[model samples]
Target chain A: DEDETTALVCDNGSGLVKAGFAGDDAPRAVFPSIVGRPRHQMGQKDSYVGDEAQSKRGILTLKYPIEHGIITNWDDMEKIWHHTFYNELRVAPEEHPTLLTEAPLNPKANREKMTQIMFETFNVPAMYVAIQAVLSLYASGRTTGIVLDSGDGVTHNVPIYEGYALPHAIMRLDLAGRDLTDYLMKILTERGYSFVTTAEREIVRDIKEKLCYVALDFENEMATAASSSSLEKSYELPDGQVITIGNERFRCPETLFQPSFIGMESAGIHETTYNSIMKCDIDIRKDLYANNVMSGGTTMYPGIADRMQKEITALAPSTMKIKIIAPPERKYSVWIGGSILASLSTFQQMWITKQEYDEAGPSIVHRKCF
Target chain B: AGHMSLAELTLEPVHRRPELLDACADLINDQWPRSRTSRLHSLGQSSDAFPLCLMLLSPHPTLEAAPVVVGHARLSRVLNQPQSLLVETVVVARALRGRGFGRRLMEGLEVFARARGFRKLHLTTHDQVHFYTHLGYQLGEPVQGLVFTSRRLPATLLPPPPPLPECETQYQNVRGRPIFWMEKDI
Candidate 1:
């Protein structure tokens, strides 16, 4: 009978939040993970959440409740979740079971707080918090693999073995889409272009998304920086100023491979992936190498898969085969995975129900959901 | 032309009066016309905790006229420094640049930040070092470890694992012109 209930799937990321009903092709609503409120004391009606927050950003003070894949501001986060249910989805929280996605390595306290909110505030009949990396793997219809999720805020290398994440092998890189945008702004400014204003910086970010690509051969790409017209592209500013961009295209994305471009000391995405795979048991390394899945906004860059595969192939064993799975909808893979998981009839039994919560309490989430 | 007195101009966060957001965005876009959409998006990101976006308004000489947005600036949190804030995108109406509105804007933000318990303010400037120095800011080294966010959980929550092998290759600075990193105790 629980299978008859339509569940809600919400994936909250540092940059965006995706929410929709179970069994959907994609999330019904996708918006920035931000909340906006008037600086002076104002009524609840004045505050805006999610997409509304993004639209009204110029007037209100915005706060990103979730920073680096974790909920830091619970009060603001409640407003965001409330907006997702009442404003966007138009679903009563009391009717449907809810499935939420969280980043790997989330602290116990955060999870408990989330459980409390879902049970107490929303009064949902049932809920489950799933690890985002596992959900990403599920989106690809696989139960075992390594998922390299790189989004606006951070990059995570998570190796999942049959639905369970190997916590010790997990790797995190702080550099991501935001850092790359900053790096592009730095280089563009060197070309005598000014992008100091916040709005101008956003334009530079658009340029990066359009022209930037990971170079298969960094040296060869740098050599062609000059003379090759194909390597150069033009972007028209909002004011109609045409700007020509050259090596900065590939050079900007190159930071994901060589983080030294941004002066960061951490290992690049490829090295981090290989390092994570090596930490796992010997038997699982083959599967991990063969099924490297890419998820998140940063991974949507052109030639990312090829570059990641080529670089990791160099570090891996000569005899072992390497693969990087990149689906067309990988950007929403986590939410899609949540959709698929929540839609399953068997999964209906897995949710922590209101009755169970009343008995076992919030700690039951760690025991049951994991 | 009668010069406007500083006492008549009021500095406030634009969100308090939603009507000011569009005017502030237009004022900023007129100075830097890359994108009005993006400008509004950035100005909207002002939060009470950090990265507060503020607007300076001048009441119309006529009592019936609406106030005008004359200046704007943003104060963001310094990376890994809870007690410090970074002041950026400080701009004034093109017609009002020579006036003391910029100074007034900075002074107001200092009081605002101090009240919120921020002990220091940091900023980067290319040709305005002398301007900032006149406001009591001292030049300093470019701040290191300036990042967007830290994903790793605290060691107490998640135990430290083995460290990754360090990269042997060091990169040369291929960035733009050297800007001044200035700071001041609030």
Candidate 2:
């Protein structure tokens, strides 16, 4: 093995973070990436026992530290990193090589700074940056895979060609959990929503999962949903509270395909992803256009694969063959891939050792890679 | 100069403190539960990614950041300082708690008020109504100027609600709503 493969798998968007040897099937440990303090004064630093960061303090101050798929407040980011690397890393730094997953083509400066901090701070033996979807393909043991990463951040597709990524083979759409949440919240508010609390936003999300589905024919589905069938979209909260959803229940998810429908002043996912792919290594367009892999938490939504295939294929050349892999636990694909890469003996060769880092220095890394 | 002593007094605007966030988060953690109020002590200006209130500095008075925030000190204009129509947040902080430092902050405020040719000093306090009275700021009869917490809304406020059906009674379900408004003219 060229690199000792270790995965520093983290779903920065999903609140869940996991790390383990990539070859392993499941994660070693998964922790929610959240910090909370009591909302009221009596509880100054009382966040929560484990998962209840939500209800511990009435006005409990908590921050996800990751929003829109990127770290917020770099210095504060260290606190979270410290938790993962030092507290939950579980393995001795020397025991394993690491494969870290990162967003494709992130801001170069941020990437450089993050790389510097990781090598300098944790002193991991070796590191390789990976796109999470490609990593998921590794976990799937697929030689040629099409992964659509649908998670808390962005829903994106990355094409894998025989265990290696086709250069610049990523297409991302601005459709994901956040957009879904915003859509649901807006719809509910317009429908005279009494529950506008952050805690309740999840309720709307649950409703979408429980009662909503992708419409095969947009008009037909919209009409059928509007027919007031037996499938009542209404759901009750912890208390006896309830929301009687109407025809607009499907409106939020509907916007995923039709960009112009939800006017956010920015182009919708269909166009954005197409545009990103257009800018990628132009030579590979034919291959990438043929093999499109989609994997992410959000992609698990029913009918999503069919819809994405339809929408994306329409945009690609007529000769293209479009295939979208629906991962069993699409949400953990990135975390799993990052984990596998970290565990691979060959992947270890990708990381820069501490001495090499010290000798090669930040400038070499920045000028050459970043 | 005749009777006042500036020796023990230190005055500075609340926004000027270098550790503004640490102090302000502490402030929110402190003020929030007691009165059910909170203020997100932001780090930078509006354009900055984390747009927060900007901290400023002046030579007139030095109000320590933390204790002043808790105290809600009110400041009177001082002649030698940068006297203008504006008063700093620390001015209100000192006025509220009326802790041993409250009156001194008001004296500095009065210095500014007198020179501006104002018959009476006009200043607004945060939700802490009791603190300003402690500093001799009376309730203006028209009483309706109070407004702070609502303005510093949660980060989620920016989103526009999703479109609704044509016949619905309302528009966005959780769209922004103005629930309550309690104020004093002063």
* lDDT, each prediction: 0.80, 0.51
lDDT per residue for candidate 2 within B85-166, as digits (tens), equals: 2233442232233234445655655553455453454443435456556555555421111111112211111998888898
Instruction: Give lDDT tens digits, candidate 2, residues A24-115.
Output: 44555566656666655654444442244544624666667655556665765666666665556544443334555656445566666666
Question: Please, what's the RMSD in Å of model 1?
Answer: 26.2
- What overall lDDT, based on C-alpha atoms, would model 1 receive against the true structure? 0.80
i-RMSD values for every candidate model: 18.7, 24.6
Residue range with the least summed lDDT across 10 consecutive positions in model 2 chain A: A1-10
On residues B70-91, what C-alpha lDDT tens digit does candidate 1 reach at each position? 8988776655688887777788
Query: Against the hidden true structure, what lDDT does model 2 obtain?
Result: 0.51
Model 2: DockQ score: 0.01
The RMSD (Cα, Å) of candidate 2 is 26.7
Question: Candidate 1: misplaced stretches above 4 Å?
Answer: A1-3, A38-46, B1-186
